[PDB]
Motif scaffolding. Sequence first.
Motif: not given
Lengths: 93, 123, 242, 124, 110
Positions: C59, C62-63
């Motif tokens: 996550r 991806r950020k």
Amino acid sequence: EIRIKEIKENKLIGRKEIYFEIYHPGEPTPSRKDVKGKLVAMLDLNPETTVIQYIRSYFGSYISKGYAKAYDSKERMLYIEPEYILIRDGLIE
Amino acid sequence: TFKLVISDPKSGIAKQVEITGAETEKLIGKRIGDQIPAKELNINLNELFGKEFPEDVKLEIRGGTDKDGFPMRPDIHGPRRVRVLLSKGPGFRPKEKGERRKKTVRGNTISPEIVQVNVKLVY
Amino acid sequence: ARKGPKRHLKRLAAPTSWYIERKAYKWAVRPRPGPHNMRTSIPLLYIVRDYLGYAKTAREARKILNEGKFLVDGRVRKDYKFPVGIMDVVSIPETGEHYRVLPNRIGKLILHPISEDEAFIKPLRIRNKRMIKGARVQLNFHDGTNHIVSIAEKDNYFTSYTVLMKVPEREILEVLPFEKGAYVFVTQGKNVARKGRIVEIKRFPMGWPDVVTIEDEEGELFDTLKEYAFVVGTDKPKISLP
Amino acid sequence: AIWQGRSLKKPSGGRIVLARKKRKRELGREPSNTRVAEQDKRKIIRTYGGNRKVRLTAAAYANVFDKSGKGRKVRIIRVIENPANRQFARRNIITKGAIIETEIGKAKVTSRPGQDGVVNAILL
Amino acid sequence: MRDIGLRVQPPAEKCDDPKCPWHGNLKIHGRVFEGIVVSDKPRKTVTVERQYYFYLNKYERYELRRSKIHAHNPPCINAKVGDKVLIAETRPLSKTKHFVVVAVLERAEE
RNA sequence: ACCGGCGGACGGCUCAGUAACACGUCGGUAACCUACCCUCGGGAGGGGGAUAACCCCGGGAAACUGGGGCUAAUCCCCCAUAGGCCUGGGGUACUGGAAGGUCCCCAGGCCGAAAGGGAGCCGUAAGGCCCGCCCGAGGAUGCGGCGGCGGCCGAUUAGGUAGUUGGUGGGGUAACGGCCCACCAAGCCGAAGAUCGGUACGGGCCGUGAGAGCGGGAGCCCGGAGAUGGACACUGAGACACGGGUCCA
């Protein structure tokens, strides 16, 4: 007693990763708050920007590993770090 | 005993009336899109709507629903019920693109079994 | 049975060119179509999360990619399934850190760090020659990109020739031909991750590709498919090659 | 359903039972049987992969070409001979390679009206 | 004479068929084989046969196995029985035809 | 909330059948397809129409459903140019050893694009940054198709095949192919085991064993196939479509 091996800076996140070892020969496992107040002293960090996830003590071992994170601003944890380790550290009710 | 929904395009208001008696026999055998002058329909339309209607007002029969709720379709000759794979037309809402549902609908012709009929006003 | 294309890939069946713990989890990120082939590239998320270790969880990788900090050959790519193939240059200017993806002797991809001066040159092998209406010649590179040239200069190019390709602004720099003595780096085969010089060109008929005999720096003679040979310099390699 | 599937017999005449049904991709389509008419009637058909196939069903004009290379848009009177099959010529049905009678004379069709949608022929 | 890239002299006379690799439309690609003609009764068709041995794990002796192949025979060569012939993979011709004869190495009389 | 962009065609499940170019491997398309992805070159102009939500008045224990009033976009349609396709003639340059294909010109004919957008900074605006749309050319993700070889039992199953096998000329297919049609001819397979029947998803593998070997293929991965048995369309780049649809029992 807590002694460090790893102090690594992630500048894409602007955050410090600390891998440390706690010597606890013969006494019960230290709690989150105690080590939290212990590291911040000689590492000189802002307590609110600093968070710990895990402290693993092995079977039949008096030296336990532990990992903490040290951010800079109050929004980095709210954006990037997940919501559990604020609650487990009391940073969020 | 029919419920006739009379809709005025100019006002965009529709009002329901009841047709009973031998007046009912005037509506038997008619189709959809059929025009008919107001006079023999015997409804005090000027008095319900509260606005003047010239004597040349006519009504066109367009829609309605059956006793159970079966609607009307001009496309199907006669009044009978025929199960049809519905791609488009009255009495069917496609939800997923390309859907075809087999629905049973009432034919175009007006039958005694109809309880709801819809008409539109013209002047 | 299956009825249309699929969006999933088990961790077990992942390509052998990846450094990934196969039994860590059930699922792995499916590579979307892109510049290179499946055997040649990897999703960027595995580079960020595993090779660099900046992000522990997918996550946050991806950020960060959404923030666009990472430059892929001088172009921000926020997608977290982009395929990065051979001799692609990954540059992160915030660290100033630039790497080139190269095959291992084992045949897996590894990051060779490079200086800044090497971060704006990409060598591309000319996969095919074609030409489009308006008599405009077009060259399809090994990495799936396409470039247009005019008819006059067509004799300066041939299939399999290397071109030093200024990717920041799409400027051709130099053309390295495919001739005896050229310095060559292998991309596939048992001789993968080798560097030598061309000796003989074995033309093969009946659909069988050409075999090039490459002599190593120490003089060891081996053979390798023409497609697998990547020219990197006229006599000495123009790039830092492990 | 027109199935362009496997032959149900082995080369050695052995019977084969189908282990699986008919997939959608392997079905066929209706022959055009393009007829001669006073107008040009065509159908655009959505096909495999979203492509479009134009299909001429009624034909009224043709491109008669000379050996030099010039083309002329001239009408179609009738069909002379269809070597593919003798029933088509009687029914004014046009297919590739058929011989057509037009104002110019005799022309041989070098087109696929069921797929191309157009009629092109060479004067003879 | 249009090259196919196989080391053999083309047949002398040319043919107007659209199926001759030297004088037609179809092309040569794929595997190649050498065999012997055993049957050629139907029109422009051949049934070449190829003999070879097969090894077995349990008995470690050899077992002869045969392969019959249907290649197209264009008129320019006109294969007959008793002839050794080179065959090549082609595009699907018919239900069973998927090969073509490209050379005659020895006539029947040899 | 309706149109609308996407997904619901993958992922879940089982091993009934299926002796099959089903599958393992190797070539394999020059005879094909490709939404979502990337690169290069170009375009994105003008015009018209549209109905939900909402208002009211309605059917029915139902399922579920009518009418009129009013409305939008990146909803639909129209015009133009490019672009796509086919054919004839001519002349070259490129892919590849090959073939044809691709290319340039002429001719004839057909079909025949779009979409701009929320916010923010500057700018009077314009315009720049962000995202989005279409045409040509590929690549790539997948998919289709062809072939060589390997892969069980029965002789108290010995001849089998009629669109059958091949050819000519055509059709439909995204695509070649009797896949299909008209004619032409008698081919094709079988004792090295056809046909018929029994049995059965194939493989990586697993059990035992000193091993030669024997036995098995459920449990994890790949490939093949199926939604109660059967049959069929539409919509979609992708289906005859488990939580989409239609018919018989």
